[PDB]
Amino acid sequence: GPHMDVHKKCPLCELMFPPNYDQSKFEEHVESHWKVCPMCSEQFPPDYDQQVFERHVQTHFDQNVLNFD
């Protein structure tokens, strides 16, 4: 950390943490913004659209109407 080590902010929502905050706890928070499809276990970038993500997740519920096969 430099003279300004208050850069520990989630660049995705700008939640600002103290300089002494856990890097990995920071990263998991960044990875929380990476929207994870529970059915893909894939994390989608913050650059991804929530609308697109929600429709993506919806298609996992849609399942192309899995009737049997």
Smallest distance, Zn ion to C-beta of residue 1, A: 19
**9 annotated as a binding-site residue:** no
Q: Mark residues 20-39: x for contact with Zn ion by CB under 5 A, - for none.
A: -----------------x--
Residues 6+ apart with CB under 8 A from 57: 37, 38, 39
Q: How far apart are CA 2 and CA 58, in angstroms?
A: 44
- Pick the closer one to Zn ion by CB: 5 or 13: 13
Sign of CA dihedral 24, 27, 29, 34: negative
15: contact with Zn ion by CB under 5 A: yes
User: Is 40 annotated to bind ligand?
Assistant: yes
